[PDB]
């Protein structure tokens, strides 16, 4: 016969191994493949679809109120409207997004993000915003003249319900990592802020408060490494009727 | 030697594995193959042979009386004569058939069935029947004008001792499955009903009650998957003289 010797790792069950195993049903013919719409071959296809940010993750914002930011007419100039924390691996306005939930199955991530904001006032509502991405380093900018020194788009939502703020991949390292440390130089993406560039200016019969829905997607330079269990689901018991599978 | 490692599943005995094993008798020469009539290479060959349905699975129908349906002259029109439940994976008129018994070694099945009915009255017996296949959905049809809206054959058994009712494969899924649930949308085939299309009309010296023998076979579009133990045989003891094999 063949002289063999067992290596270290013989007999182990690694849950990520990749081997052929014994067919429980020999000569089983599986049901013919039918074309089904919407096949996903790679999870980055899902991650590039824009999905609603929960920017209004505050108390009193109940349920669906959390998925829009109400902007009002202001009587001071250059005013901050909202800000968005940018670590997609953490909990925050980006977590329950398609880019956020798939990324939290992973630890390492690279690539640009896009933020799309849809203005949902009336047709008669006019105004200009400036959407600033600040690369990390210091505190989040609180004045407009500080935030526009970073990456920004200026958006007239007069006829234009939407713009995109590209958050470009600006990192020292090839990837950013989750380590449960938001302030880490390997983790922190910087900030998104929004300012009144002019003012929300509505007539008397428009609603004086208008809403913004924010989206986030990943671009196609986006990558995810190091697959981990998701912190977004968990259990400390068995589910209901799980015992009925044994009966 | 060869560096090896044992996989999960090493040392297991799967009863459906497919391996070469050690010859108990080296250089044994088996007896030369002789041609024997009736070789079966695939169990679907057996399943396409028509065999008697036990449509008269009622009490007082004793033994062989269960394999024929007595039809009589009626004095009302459009009358129901018999019906047949159609799940070949279940107990009913189709179970102790060649298509039924082989199918109950399997769980999944596809393909058309044929039902052949032989009229066994006298030569002088005349009449027309309508044999209706109803695809599933609602209740079994009880009137003739409801059942003929489905698949049917109209049969004059005047000179014609036999017809075939093709039960065509009309299913949403590629296969129908047994799950011990007769009313399941993955299981229920629908109904076969028989009605007086005209009347059994015999002269005075013919027997006034005539019999129908029903057959069922599978067609050649028939398939069986997922092999299971048969529910048709069982034991809770050892058989007689089985201990004598140890003596």
């Amino acid at each position: 016969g063949v002289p063999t010797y067992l290596l270290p790792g013989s007999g182990q069950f690694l849950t990520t191994d990749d081997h052929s195993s014994a067919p429980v049903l020999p000569c089983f013919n599986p049901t013919p493949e039918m074309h089904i719409p919407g096949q996903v071959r790679n999870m980055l296809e899902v991650v590039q679809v824009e999905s609603m940010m929960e920017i209004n993750n505050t108390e009193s914002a109940v349920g669906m109120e959390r998925l829009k930011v109400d902007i009002s007419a202001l009587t001071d100039v250059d005013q901050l409207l909202f800000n968005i924390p940018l670590d997609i691996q953490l909990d925050g306005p980006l977590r329950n997004t398609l880019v956020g939930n798939i990324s939290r199955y992973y630890t390492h991530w690279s690539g640009s993000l896009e933020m799309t904001f849809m203005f949902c006032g009336s047709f008669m509502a006019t105004g200009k915003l400036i959407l600033c991405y600040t690369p990390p380093g210091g505190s989040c900018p609180t004045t407009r003249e500080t935030a526009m020194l970073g990456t920004h788009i200026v958006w007239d939502f007069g006829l234009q319900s939407s713009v995109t703020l590209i958050i470009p991949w600006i990192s020292g390292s090839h990837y950013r990592m989750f380590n449960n440390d938001a302030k880490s130089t390997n983790a922190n993406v910087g900030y998104v802020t929004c300012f009144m560039q002019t003012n929300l200016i509505v007539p008397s019969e428009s609603s004086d408060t208008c809403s913004l829905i924010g989206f986030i997607a990943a671009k196609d330079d986006f990558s995810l490494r190091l697959m981990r269990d998701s912190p977004d689901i968990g259990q400390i018991d068995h589910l209901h009727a799980a015992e009925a599978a044994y009966q | 030697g060869v560096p090896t490692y044992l996989l999960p599943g090493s040392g297991q005995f799967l009863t459906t594995d497919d391996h070469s094993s050690a010859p108990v008798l080296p250089c044994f020469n088996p007896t030369p193959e002789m041609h024997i009539p009736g070789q079966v290479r695939n169990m679907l060959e057996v399943v396409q042979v028509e065999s008697m349905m036990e449509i008269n699975n009622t009490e007082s129908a004793v033994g062989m009386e269960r394999l024929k349906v007595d039809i009589s002259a009626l004095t009302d029109v459009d009358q129901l004569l018999f019906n047949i439940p159609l799940d070949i994976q279940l107990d009913g008129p189709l179970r102790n058939t060649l298509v039924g018994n082989i199918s109950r070694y399997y769980t999944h099945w596809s393909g058309s069935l044929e039902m052949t009915f032989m009229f066994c009255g006298s030569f002088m017996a005349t009449g027309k029947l309508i044999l209706c296949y109803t695809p599933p959905g609602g209740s079994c049809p009880t009137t003739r004008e409801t059942a003929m809206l489905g698949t049917h054959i109209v049969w004059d058994f005047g000179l014609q001792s036999s017809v075939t009712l093709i039960i065509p494969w009309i299913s949403g899924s590629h296969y129908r499955m047994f799950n011990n649930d007769a009313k399941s949308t993955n299981a229920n085939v629908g109904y076969v009903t028989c009605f007086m299309q005209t009347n059994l009309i015999v002269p005075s010296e013919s027997s006034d009650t005539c019999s129908l023998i029903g057959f069922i076979a599978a067609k050649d579009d028939f398939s069986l998957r997922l092999m299971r133990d048969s529910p048709d045989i069982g034991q809770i003891d050892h058989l007689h003289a089985a201990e004598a094999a140890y003596q």
């Binding site: 016969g1 063949v2 002289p3 | 080296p26 250089c27």
Partner: peptide, 30 residues
């Protein structure tokens, strides 16, 4: 199959179908 260096180590040689039964059944000369 034999991975040993000695030829006697091999499996049994069940392949010799040469027979000469006449050296036992006809050991005669004429």
């Amino acid at each position: 199959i034999n991975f040993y260096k000695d030829s006697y180590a091999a499996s049994a040689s069940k392949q010799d179908f040469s027979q000469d039964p006449s050296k036992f059944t006809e050991p005669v000369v004429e």
